[PDB]
Amino acid sequence: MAQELTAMSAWVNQDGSTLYINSINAQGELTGSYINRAAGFACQNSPYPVNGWVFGTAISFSTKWLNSVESCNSITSWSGFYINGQGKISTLWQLVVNGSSSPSQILKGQDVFSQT
Amino acid sequence: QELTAMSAWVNQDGSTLYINSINAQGELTGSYINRAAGFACQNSPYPVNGWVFGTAISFSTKWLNSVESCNSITSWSGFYINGQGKISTLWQLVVNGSSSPSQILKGQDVFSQTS
Incomplete structure (x- = not known):
């Protein structure tokens, strides 16, 4: 039924942006990709690498806004x-x-990610 | 005079961030030693990951290591x-x-470079 917080799980926020969780290793260290789709913003539609941690149901992840196509000169951490x-983060x-x-x-806000 | 690999930074509680590597993409590895009096998960290294972008930096640690757990994750x-270099x-x-x-608990830390 609801999607769980696992390796190879994808999550979409209220802007349409997706976290693609790739690996969660034995220690709970996370890798993945992020695609921003927030209308009007830069660094959209291309993958940005993500790292972070999972501890049970707690999660942190962060992306540097630099890839092979575009820079937004900043870093976001969730x-x-x-x-x-429905599974949500x-x-x-x-x-x-x-x-x-x-x-x-330092800008702050709230995102709620829902299962794909 | 900038963020570098192989650097140490101490906050107002006496806790130290050890930056071990910053790769070609600016991905960070390190260790964190919490020394805030009265708290658990003190005096042992906790792995850190994160990113550096010029003078911007993020780093995060899961509070589980070979010694003990505090059931949580901190992100800076x-x-x-x-x-004086500071973060x-x-x-x-x-x-x-x-x-x-x-x-979700929040606060401010200022880390001073100690080298």
Whole structure:
């Protein structure tokens, strides 16, 4: 029924962006890819590498916005947890931009990812 | 005078981030030793991963190692500022089994380069 938090699981947020979880190793270290689809924003439609951690239903993942096609000069990190007939990951994220000088410049928000 | 591999950074609690590698893509590995008095998961290395992008940095550690578990994950987002190199960060701590975003703990750490 509901999708679980596993290796090879995909999750789509309220902007249409997808986290593709690839591996979760014996220690819970995560690899994957992220495709941003937030309308009006840059760094869309191409895969960005992700790393992070899973601990039971807790998860962190982070992406650097640089790949072979486009840079957005920043890094986003999500912290969240799995909840469940639809599996979801509820998160709070922080975005830090290269060249920042003040903590006030770190952007924050909430994403809820739903199973594919 | 910038974020580098093989560097050590100590926060206001006396906890140390050891940056071990920053690869060609800026992917980070390291270890974290928590030394905040009264807390568990102290004095032993916890593996770290993350990213560096110029002066921006993210790093995260799962609180499970060969010694003990604190059932949670901390993630830091921050930036390098500079004679003293520092990393100014905001962190979030998520606990296994949480049910509400209100349960994600937040704070600020400033790490000073100690070399």
